[PDB]
Design a protein around this ligand. Structure first.
Ligand SMILES: CCCCCCCCCCCCCCCCCC(=O)OC[C@H](COP(=O)([O-])OCC(O)COP(=O)([O-])OC[C@@H](COC(=O)CCCCCCCCCCCCCCCCC)OC(=O)CCCCCCCCCCCCCCCCC)OC(=O)CCCCCCCCCCCCCCCCC
Ligand SMILES: CCCCCCCCCCCCCCCCCC(=O)OC[C@H](COP(=O)([O-])OCC[N+](C)(C)C)OC(=O)CCCCCCCCCCCCCCCCC
Ligand SMILES: CCCCCCCCCCCCCCCCCC(=O)OC[C@H](COP(=O)(O)OCCN)OC(=O)CCCCCCCCCCCCCCCCC
Ligand code: SF4
Ligand code: SF4
Ligand code: SF4
Lengths: 176, 357, 155, 318, 145, 70, 55
């Protein structure tokens, strides 16, 4: 199927010519352009004021990373290493040694925050969903160094943004 | 008389970086390939990859694939006309309709979790399922959308000074456009009868009714009416697809190419091993080459990826719609004023992120 | 005394500076489209007394966004030097911040900071319009905590 | 006692000109569904002061290739003529009662082009010089239409004395007698002041800065204040020839507010017009004038010059 | 007739703002003169509001506390000051204010949410958290053979 | 809503109101209550010289009616 | 959306088109941000029998 979009024969009667002659002379299609501008002026603006209000998001939002931990308190990060093999920017970096007890927790988990793209792949990669992307997106900075994250900063994000992502994953794991 | 540009201001690794990544890691490349229409690129790459694996997606996954593919089709034509409005001098239109783009962007956030770079279309079907109520949100927006595009229509089409600045201002004849690699809308506005949607009905496209907007002589105005008509037709493709959503699945039931469900991941070993290997090296694609193109909302978007029988691609040259359509600029601007060049670009779609392959 | 006088004058000047930040948005890639969502009817950019301005001669903050290739590099520095005092550059997105996912590419300079003294680093890929607006608010407060007249007074 | 009136005239324009930028930015915002500046003070009212002195406290770079003398002269004469332009306005009692005031209005309107020309040439930039001669050729081309339309309009007034306009336009607005020339006059005004759709002299996305080019805190603010000084007044000229109000001598305040409101509403349309319409191309911008306006302009002048003799309604010049 | 109740809302705005002083406070500090129902109040002073009639995005809003974690804030409105539990409801990610449903109790959750600390002494600085490699030699202590 | 525009034009109109109001009131004040008599032609000028000469105080806007004549 | 009827007529007449019933931005029609838990189906090969990968 197809549909012509431009072809059209203008009517050639005196009324039609007068219509077109009036249109060029007494600008009517021009005034129509002005006509619905006023309708836009006398309308509610959609201006969300910030930080007072917030454009809606979803329980699946991907933002600042935050390494979580078990309800007992122990780190979820198993050093399973899979997040690297999927990280398409190779932002993360995992190296682990046997702990004092023996349970391996990474001695270095440094997401280069100005490297990743917030894939959601690292979340989809973790078999114990240790690394998540917190709903926070307002974490700008002034020195390039503060962007460069580490294991401790990740853990602090997990402990700071803990209730939200625990709730978000609780309401979103069924889709996953 | 002569107009050859110089690009590379956004030339990037793309194909060069792709070879050192796996297919799944190569998916974000296409999302960021062009910076305007994201979802439709993953349409091409996933289609090409699933073609190499001889795995067809579940029927439902195709239906979301087309639904969001045409939602992004709605995204693309909005900016091309309104940026043409920004060029041509009409600042009001691009503010009005662009508020509507925030609604589809909100839809993108609800499904994928990212506002623009969804990374949603994956080989073997879409990654995740729609949230409960996303379909309703589409209908609420779509109900009022034609009302918004009419607001664009009234002030940006019959405006006497929009018309003259878009009529007769640059035109390409039939064989000239055909032989310049022009494709998709660019030929359709010049009168050529061709459309990837119908002639080569990729995905579930052979079950939805729509009308391609072929036009007159083929100047800036001609394709302009073609583009807005595409949005109206895209609205029906949305509407047909909105009440056709079947009770199916989102991913292929082949764990060797699709990550297993997280619930079964932490329970069954075959899921764990398959998730492990798929997330370490990924699926191995059988060797060969394939150029598969889809109708981009800008032109003909094709990826000619060649498989080395490994878990990674070998070379993934892209048919960039911006590329081939920038190739025509020299003949496209034979005999026109300097102030026309920006509008000469405007009738086309040259996103500097996409032209560079 | 004189210290109070210069402090009030310092307050007045920075009040203007943290109000009329006419930006050079120099974005090149998908970081550029999401910035318009901050010039949006949804989140107004003009509502904080700042209007997207051409003619880099009259501009204060340069919003750099998108991936930065070597070819663009000579052109980015020349416009930065053409920018008048005061001039602040806000690096938007992973690509412009440190190179981002286009890091190891042969034709990408890792981060805009290697070419220009970035003042605000806005992370994101893309940085959501709210996030980049927050960075602008962060830069606005940075102008507030400025002591130009104090340093000259106490030189 | 007189420097009173000069200052009581000048400073209000600068304040009115400055708040037009707010009014423009906010009107456009609501025009294209936005709110505009509203966070710098109540409803952004303090924003004009914020940006203005900001445009006085930011460093004024002098281009190396720029000639300093002309780069300083062009804003000076562009600003100076605009301020002197306001002195013969027949606002209740005009400050300057020049019997040839309308000629005085046009004489100064023909010198703003020098502010356009020199600033374009002084900047000594390829982008400036093509912006300059194009800009000057546009505005002096609309001079002939601007001059003739008036000649038709005041031909029924009696002379070029601006205060006489209130006497002629007493029972009805003069638009009801020359409305073919009304939009013809009004449309030509945006051409002269270079406002969209006739905004070829700025072109933020085409000419980047137009005739303003490399102008910043200092000379730029004068140009921005100059351009937003002419916009405020071409209303007053329009609100004097065309729609006016009674001037009961016992209450001159009655003429003030009535005149002020018309000069306010028309300025909104000027701002409103920029919102919707696309921006002209140069060829058409000259084509519309020389070919679609000039033959119309000449014919109406013949009609308006034979109508009073036809109907024995010649106006008294005294 | 339709004009009077609109002005009635305008005058009711001052009534709901606790007098003229409260009206000018919100008009300057928040630049949003609107009366909404008190949904909840967190542990810092952040007062949250909701209004069904307002459209999506202005459905829920908040006027921040004047003081939290030391930083005096009256003209220092920021988006990083929202505690995590209210970060859900405020962004409209879930129609469930924390005052109704409180977060699941855990020992390790921060008791005091922190604002954006960048640009201040307590900001962040990256560092290598690995231990060391290549252990060096050590001789007894008297030099040259 | 749209009424937030009105404060923007409020200080517009009031400020634009004053130059007309002023240049009338000092005109009233300078010319002894009445307005500034305007001489568009020589008649209305050499008129005022008669009034200025006849006032005795060298002020045109001073009137001398029937009480002046003998 | 909340404007009085008279001003609604003004924008209605200036546009000539029913902007009230199809006003642009969202209102109390969207799906609640809280939603019932989903129960996503099983795939086209989630059969415990006669389902060898070779087939
Ligand atoms: C010029 C036109 C005449 C003056 C304005 C008339 C006007 O606003 O009428 C109300 C209303 C405003 O527009 P709307 O979109 O209908 O308002 C929708 C809601 O009622 C609006 O709901 P709302 O929640 O916004 O209602 C509260 C609102 C109510 O606001 C009003 O009623 C506006 C009047 C000031 C209070 O007041 C506020 O929000 C308080 C802040 C006020 C900011 C400063 C306002 C300055 C006004 C001008 C001052 C002098 C210069 O217009 C009408 O009812 C009809 C059109 C105007 C007719 C005027 C008479 C003929
Ligand atoms: C007894 C009666 C004697 C007199 C009778 C006179 C004839 C009847 C009346 C004829 C119409 C009036 C005179 C002509 C006016 C138009 C001139 C013209 O060339 O127009 C066509 C021209 C040219 O149109 P065109 O170019 O498409 O076609 C003309 C013919 N060619 C192609 C050969 C050139 O177009 C315009 O003027 C369009 C508008 C340009 C300006 C853009 C902004 C418009 C803003 C409009 C809203 C504001 C209005 C404010 C009004 C005043 C308020 C105080
Ligand atoms: C009532 C009784 C009278 C009724 C009307 C009678 C006259 C009708 C004239 C019709 C128009 C002239 C003929 C014509 O069709 O000319 C078209 C042509 C268009 O030129 P253009 O738009 O540049 O396009 C060129 C490329 N196609 O035109 C041209 O190229 C030439 C245009 C010349 C314009 C001259 C304008 C002069 C000023 C206005 C007229 C003043 C009065 C003159 C005397 C009139 C006496 C009756
Ligand atoms: S974060 Fe998860 S996937 Fe990454 S190393 Fe730790 S346990 Fe493995
Ligand atoms: S979400 Fe970011 S950190 Fe995680 S794998 Fe993807 S790019 Fe890397
Ligand atoms: S940082 Fe991310 S969003 Fe921005 S240009 Fe680079 S890839 Fe695109």
């Amino acid at each position: 199927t197809y549909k012509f979009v431009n072809m059209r024969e203008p009517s050639m009667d005196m009324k039609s010519v007068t219509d077109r002659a009036a249109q060029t002379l007494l600008w009517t299609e021009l005034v129509r352009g002005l006509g619905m501008t006023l309708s836009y002026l006398f309308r509610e603006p959609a201006t969300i004021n910030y930080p007072f209000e917030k454009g809606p998001l979803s329980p699946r939002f991907r933002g600042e990373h935050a390494l979580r931990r078990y309800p007992s308190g122990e780190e979820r990060c198993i050093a399973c290493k899979l997040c690297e093999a999927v990280c398409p920017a190779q932002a993360i970096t995992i190296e682990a040694e046997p702990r004092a007890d023996g349970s391996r927790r990474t001695t270095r988990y440094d997401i280069d925050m100005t490297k990743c793209i917030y894939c959601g792949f690292c979340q989809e990669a973790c078999p114990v969903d240790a690394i998540v992307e917190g709903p926070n997106f307002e974490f700008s900075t002034e020195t390039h160094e503060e962007l460069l994250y580490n294991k401790e900063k990740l853990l602090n994000n997990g402990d700071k943004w803990e209730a939200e992502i625990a709730a978000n994953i609780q309401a979103d794991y069924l889709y996953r | 008389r002569k107009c050859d540009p110089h690009i590379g201001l956004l030339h990037r690794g793309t194909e060069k970086l792709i070879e050192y990544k796996t297919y799944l890691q190569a998916l974000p490349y296409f999302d960021r390939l062009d910076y305007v229409s994201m979802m439709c690129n993953e349409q091409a790459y996933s289609l090409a990859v699933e073609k190499l694996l001889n795995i067809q997606p579940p029927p439902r996954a195709q239906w979301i694939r087309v639904l969001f593919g045409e939602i992004t089709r709605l995204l693309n034509h909005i900016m091309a006309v309104t940026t043409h409005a920004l060029d041509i001098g009409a600042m009001t239109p691009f503010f009005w309709m662009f508020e509507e783009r925030e609604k589809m962007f909100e839809f993108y956030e609800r499904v994928s979790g990212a506002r623009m770079h969804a990374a949603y279309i994956r080989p073997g079907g879409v990654h995740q399922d729609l949230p409960l109520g996303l379909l309703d949100d589409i209908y609420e927006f779509s109900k009022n959308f034609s009302f918004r595009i009419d607001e664009l229509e009234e002030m940006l089409t019959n405006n006497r000074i929009w018309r003259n600045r878009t009529v007769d201002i640059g035109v390409v004849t039939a064989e000239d456009a055909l032989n310049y690699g022009f494709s998709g809308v660019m030929l359709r506005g010049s009168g050529i009868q061709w459309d990837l949607r119908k002639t080569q009905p990729y995905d579930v496209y052979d079950q939805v009714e729509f009308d391609v907007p072929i036009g007159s002589r083929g100047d800036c105005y001609d394709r302009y009416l073609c583009r807005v008509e595409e949005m109206r037709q895209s609205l029906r493709i949305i509407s047909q697809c909105l009440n056709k959503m079947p009770p199916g699945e989102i991913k292929v039931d082949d764990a060797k190419v699709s990550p297993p469900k997280r619930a079964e991941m932490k329970t069954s070993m075959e899921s764990l091993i398959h998730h492990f290997k798929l997330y370490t090296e990924g699926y191995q694609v059988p060797p060969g080459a394939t150029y598969t193109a889809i109708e981009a909302p800008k032109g003909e978007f094709g990826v000619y990826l060649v498989s080395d029988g490994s878990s990674r691609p070998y070379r993934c040259k892209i048919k960039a719609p911006g590329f081939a359509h920038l190739a025509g600029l020299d003949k496209m601007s034979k005999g026109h004023m300097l102030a026309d060049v920006v509008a000469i670009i405007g009738t086309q779609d040259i996103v500097f992120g996409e032209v560079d392959r | 005394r004189g210290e109070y006088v210069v402090a009030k004058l310092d307050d007045l000047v920075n009040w203007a500076r943290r109000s009329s930040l006419w930006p050079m948005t120099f974005g090149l890639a998908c970081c550029a489209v999401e910035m318009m969502h901050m010039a949006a009817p949804r989140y107004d950019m003009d509502r904080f007394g700042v209007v997207f301005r051409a003619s880099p001669r009259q501009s204060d903050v340069m919003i750099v966004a998108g991936t930065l290739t070597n070819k663009m590099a000579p052109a980015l520095r020349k416009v930065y030097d053409q920018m008048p005092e005061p001039r602040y550059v806000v690096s938007m997105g992973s690509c412009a911040n440190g190179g981002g996912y286009y890091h190891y590419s042969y034709s990408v300079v890792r981060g805009c900071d290697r070419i220009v003294p970035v003042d605000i680093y806005v992370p994101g890929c893309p940085p959501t319009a709210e996030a980049l607006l927050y960075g602008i608010l962060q830069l606005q407060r940075k102008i507030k905590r400025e002591k130009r007249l104090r340093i000259w007074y106490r030189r | 006692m007189f420097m009173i009136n000069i200052l009581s005239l000048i400073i209000p324009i600068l304040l009115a000109v400055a708040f037009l930028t707010l009014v423009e930015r906010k009107v456009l915002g609501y025009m294209q569904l936005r709110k505009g500046p509203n966070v710098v003070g109540p409803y952004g009212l303090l924003q004009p002061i914020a940006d203005a002195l900001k445009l006085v406290t930011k460093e004024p770079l002098r281009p190396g290739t720029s000639s300093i003398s002309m780069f300083i002269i062009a804003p000076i004469l562009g600003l100076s003529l605009a301020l002197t332009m306001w002195v013969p306005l027949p606002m209740p009692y005009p400050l300057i009662n020049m019997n040839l005031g309308v000629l005085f209005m046009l004489a100064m309107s023909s010198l703003a082009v020098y502010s356009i020309l020199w600033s374009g040439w002084a900047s000594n930039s390829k982008y400036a010089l093509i912006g300059a001669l194009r800009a000057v050729a546009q505005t002096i081309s609309y001079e002939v239409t601007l001059a003739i339309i008036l000649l038709s309009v005041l031909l029924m007034n009696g002379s070029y004395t601006l205060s006489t306009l209130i006497t002629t336009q007493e029972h009805i607005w003069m638009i009801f007698t020359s409305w073919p020339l009304a939009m013809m006059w009004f449309i030509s005004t945006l051409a002269e002041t270079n406002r969209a759709p006739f905004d070829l002299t700025e072109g933020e996305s085409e000419l980047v800065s137009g005739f303003n080019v490399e102008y910043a805190a200092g000379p730029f603010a004068m140009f921005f204040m100059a351009e937003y000084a002419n916009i405020i007044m071409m209303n007053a000229f329009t609100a004097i020839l065309f729609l006016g109000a009674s001037h009961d001598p016992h209450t001159p305040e009655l003429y003030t507010i009535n005149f002020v409101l018309k000069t306010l509403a028309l300025t909104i349309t000027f701002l409103w017009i920029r919102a919707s319409y696309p921006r002209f191309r140069y060829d058409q911008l000259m084509h519309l004038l020389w070919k679609s306006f000039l033959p119309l302009t000449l014919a109406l002048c013949m009609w308006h010059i034979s109508l009073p003799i036809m109907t024995a309604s010649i106006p008294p010049q005294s | 007739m339709e004009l009077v109740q609109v002005l009635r809302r305008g005058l009711q705005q001052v009534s709901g703002h606790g007098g003229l002083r409260g009206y000018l406070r919100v008009l300057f500090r928040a630049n949003d003169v609107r009366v909404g129902t008190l949904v909840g109040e967190d542990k810092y002073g952040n007062k949250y509001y909701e209004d069904n009639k307002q459209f999506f995005g202005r459905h829920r809003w908040v006027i921040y506390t004047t003081e939290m974690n030391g930083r005096d804030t009256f003209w220092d409105v920021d988006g990083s000051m929202v505690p995590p539990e209210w970060h859900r409801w405020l962004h409209c990610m879930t129609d469930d204010p924390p005052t109704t449903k409180p977060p699941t109790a855990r020992k390790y959750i921060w008791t005091n949410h922190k604002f954006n600390v960048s640009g201040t002494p307590q900001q962040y600085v990256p560092y290598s958290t690995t231990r060391k490699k290549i252990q060096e030699w050590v001789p007894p202590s008297t030099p040259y053979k | 809503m749209w009424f937030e525009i009105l404060p923007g034009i409020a200080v517009m109109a009031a400020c634009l109101f004053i130059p007309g109001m002023a240049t009338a009131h000092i005109h009233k004040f300078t010319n002894g209550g009445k307005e500034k008599r305007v001489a568009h032609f020589s008649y209305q000028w050499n008129l005022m010289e008669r009034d200025r000469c006849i006032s005795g105080v060298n002020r045109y806007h001073v009137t001398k009616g029937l009480e002046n004549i003998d | 959306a909340s404007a009085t009827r008279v001003i609604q007529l003004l924008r209605n007449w200036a546009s000539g088109r029913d902007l009230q019933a199809k006003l642009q931005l969202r209102y109390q029609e969207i799906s609640k941000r809280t939603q019932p838990p989903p129960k996503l189906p099983v795939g086209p090969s989630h059969k415990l029998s006669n389902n060898y990968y070779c087939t």
